[PDB]
């Protein structure tokens, strides 16, 4: 799936054409198209957990928007398609609008339908048999959560209960016709696990940033690789976790073990589960891993280097000002305004010109 950055180009024409406008891309591996597709959506780093809705069901104008989005594709088109199904448009109609092959559309329609069931039955209806069905379709915890009106963790616990966990298969170029010594894997909800973690070495986990976007480039990926190269050289068993197809980080040669997965809490936790690393580095992949640090640590992940809290200390505008204060350092005059008129007053205080951060 291509990654775009249209919000950074307000004046720009955001429709898709023959001239590229995407800034990056993500990749996913699935035992099925549905699984593969949903995995990619959740690894896209756009705040999606899968087929999250774009327009409301009670919106009178909704079919108009959806139609436009479908006829003249934008980067959101994939979401608008599921929305088309929810709103009662038919596979054929969507096809006439998008020209996307029905083979694909029907699968999305299925997903929307299951989605509907979930919603209806709530968490209660999430029996092991069903949940497992949903998992095999690529559904993310966080997605089911939303539907069922629960915390993503609730779904996760639920899985732990049913002992519902994915399995890892490997890439080998030959559909298993031949044995591999390489450790290039992807998660799926199947039977046999091919992970076979070593009990041997001390393992160090490196979390990549996913698809590149403006502000989150190769620079972070450069870092991640270097972590791998270094520690491995040092003798650690290095485990890379990334889903960016373009980079050196997703080259099987770069690490001992490579997990080509969505850099999400869910997916990572699953790997940690069986891997049980010595440490996990989340400070090199940019914003993606960073935003995960807190949750990971809480879930019991052995986060090495600068603590998540420490990180938060810096990042938090307030936690920071405090520290700056403490160190008796120079900071530009700031103020946290809630109302307009508040600002204008507070502004008069601080002094123009001003830097307005949301």
């Amino acid at each position: 799936i291509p990654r775009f950055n249209f919000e950074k180009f307000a004046g720009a024409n955001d429709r898709l054409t023959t001239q590229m406008k995407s800034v990056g891309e993500v990749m996913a591996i699935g035992r099925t198209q549905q699984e593969s597709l949903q995995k990619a959506l959740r690894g896209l780093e756009v705040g999606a957990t899968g087929f999250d809705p774009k327009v409301s069901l009670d919106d009178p104008e909704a079919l108009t928007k959806i139609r436009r989005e479908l006829k003249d594709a934008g980067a959101d088109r994939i979401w608008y398609i599921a929305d088309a199904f929810r709103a009662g448009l038919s596979v054929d109609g969507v096809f006439n609008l998008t020209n996307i092959d029905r083979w694909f559309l029907v699968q999305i329609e299925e997903l929307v339908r299951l989605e509907e069931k979930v919603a209806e039955v709530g968490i209660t209806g999430l029996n092991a048999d069903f949940l497992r069905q949903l998992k095999r379709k690529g559904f993310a915890d966080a997605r089911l959560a939303k539907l069922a009106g629960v915390r993503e963790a609730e779904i996760r616990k639920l899985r732990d209960q049913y002992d519902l966990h994915p399995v890892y298969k490997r890439v080998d170029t030959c559909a298993a016709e031949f044995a591999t010594d390489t450790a290039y894997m992807y998660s799926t909800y199947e039977e046999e696990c091919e992970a076979n973690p070593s009990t041997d070495r001390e393992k160090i986990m490196v979390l990549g940033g996913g698809p590149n976007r403006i502000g989150q480039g190769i620079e972070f990926d450069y870092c991640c690789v270097h972590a791998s190269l270094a520690l491995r050289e040092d003798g650690y068993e290095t485990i890379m976790v990334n889903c960016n197809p373009e980079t050196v980080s997703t080259d099987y040669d770069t690490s001992d073990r490579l997990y080509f997965e969505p850099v999400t809490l869910e997916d990572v936790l699953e790997i940690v589960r069986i891997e049980k690393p010595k440490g996990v580095i989340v400070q090199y992949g940019g914003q993606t891993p960073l935003k995960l640090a807190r949750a990971l640590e809480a879930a019991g992940v052995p986060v090495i280097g600068t603590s998540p809290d420490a990180i938060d200390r810096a990042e938090d505008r307030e936690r920071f000002q405090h520290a700056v204060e403490r160190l008796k350092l120079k900071q530009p005059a700031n103020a946290t305004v809630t109302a307009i008129e508040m600002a204008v007053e507070k502004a008069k205080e601080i002094g123009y010109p001003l830097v307005v951060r949301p």
Partner: protein, 379 residues
């Protein structure tokens, strides 16, 4: 909920969903790496008594159509797949895969860990197995049927798939534009080739005509004498199911043909027959070669071809008589793939030059046969 279950000899079970006919199926379980060509594979006579497991998860994406039929019926004992697609999306589709299976009364299951099965077969070797599709599949029973299976080793299947009476084939190959062409008038075709139907794939016949050959398909057990009476331009030995070794009739025949000057060409089963007839020995592979990405080297030219493969037995290179030169070899495992009689206008290939499905990379082998015929007729 329509259950289906697959049990193997070793007692390894696979729970799935029924996508075909109701009932049970039994045979040798194989795996095929083709990512395309499911229909063609299914209708391959060489698959008789065999349960087909396809590696590519999505089987049936393009539905089905008659033109992709390699024989009159589905020869595969059963079908094992990871996923059956919601729909068929192909302009060439005439009938969804599930319906098609039902129509042909085939027991088939989906939604199983096709990868786990593949690794098993690859690691442990082929295994007989049984599928049971029904209201409440009985594991025990499936295991029973599974273990009970006689086993392809030593099993002549050619005699089970061959034609009752003999017949003439004058039809060529399909075209996107033209589809399947009308059958060519006999006076149109330059050469007469006699072909032994050991469970011959249509495409082979079609590709022969394509080269100017009129054909006479003859029952497997057909006698050399009967053949030689027709005064053939060349003799062709098709592909076919089971063990080539038990095929006494053919071997003998071929041997007769081998005293003559008639050019002889065999493919796969036919290639094994030609090798037995020449004095060599065959062997049953651990798991065999079933896929359309198999590299084979023309050792003479030192060139590689990506070839279609469907075979569980093989000609032991080590037992080769001297009148038998090595022409090709597998780049995957080193196994024998082609031979040429040093003394006669006789040669054979282990892979499928006719493909269908698969790479047309091996087509030129036919050309050579032609060359033999053209030269024969020169005399």
């Amino acid at each position: 909920i329509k259950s289906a279950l697959l049990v193997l000899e070793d007692g390894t079970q696979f729970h799935g969903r029924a996508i075909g006919a109701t009932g049970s199926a039994v045979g040798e379980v194989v795996f095929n790496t083709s990512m395309t060509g499911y229909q063609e594979i299914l209708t391959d006579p060489s698959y008789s008594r065999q349960i087909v497991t396809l590696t590519y998860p999505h089987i049936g994406n393009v539905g089905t159509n008659d033109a992709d039929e390699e024989s009159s019926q589905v020869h595969a004992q059963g079908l094992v797949i990871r996923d059956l697609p919601l729909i068929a999306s192909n302009f060439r589709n005439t009938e969804d895969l599930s319906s098609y299976l039902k129509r042909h009364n085939i027991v088939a299951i989906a939604d199983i860990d096709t990868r786990k099965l593949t690794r098993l077969l690859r690691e442990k070797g082929a295994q007989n197995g049984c599928i049971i599709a029904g209201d409440n599949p009985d594991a025990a029973l499936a295991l029973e049927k599974a273990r009970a299976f006689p086993g392809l080793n030593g099993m002549d299947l050619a005699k089970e798939v061959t034609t009752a009476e003999a017949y003439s084939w004058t039809q060529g190959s399909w075209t996107l534009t033209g589809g399947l062409p009308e059958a060519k008038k006999e006076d149109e075709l330059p050469f007469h080739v006699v072909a032994y139907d050991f469970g011959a794939k249509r495409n082979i016949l079609r590709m022969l005509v394509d080269r100017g050959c009129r054909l006479t398909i003859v029952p497997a057990q057909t006698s050399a004498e009967d053949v030689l009476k027709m005064n053939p331009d060349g003799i062709f030995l098709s592909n076919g199911p089971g063990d080539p070794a038990p095929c006494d009739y053919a071997i003998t025949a071929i041997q007769k043909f081998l005293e003559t000057d008639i050019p002889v060409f065999g493919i796969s089963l036919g290639h094994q027959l030609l090798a037995l007839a020449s004095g060599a020995k065959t062997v049953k592979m651990k798991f065999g070669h079933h896929g359309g990405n198999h590299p084979v080297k023309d050792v003479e030219k030192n060139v590689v071809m990506i070839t279609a493969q469907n075979h569980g037995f093989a000609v032991d290179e080590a037992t080769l008589p001297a009148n038998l030169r090595v022409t090709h070899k597998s780049l995957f495992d080193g196994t024998l793939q082609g031979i040429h009689r040093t003394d006669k206008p006789a040669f054979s290939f282990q892979g499928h030059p006719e493909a269908s499905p698969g790479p047309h990379d091996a087509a030129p082998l036919f050309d050579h046969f032609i060359e033999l015929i053209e030269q024969y007729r020169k005399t």
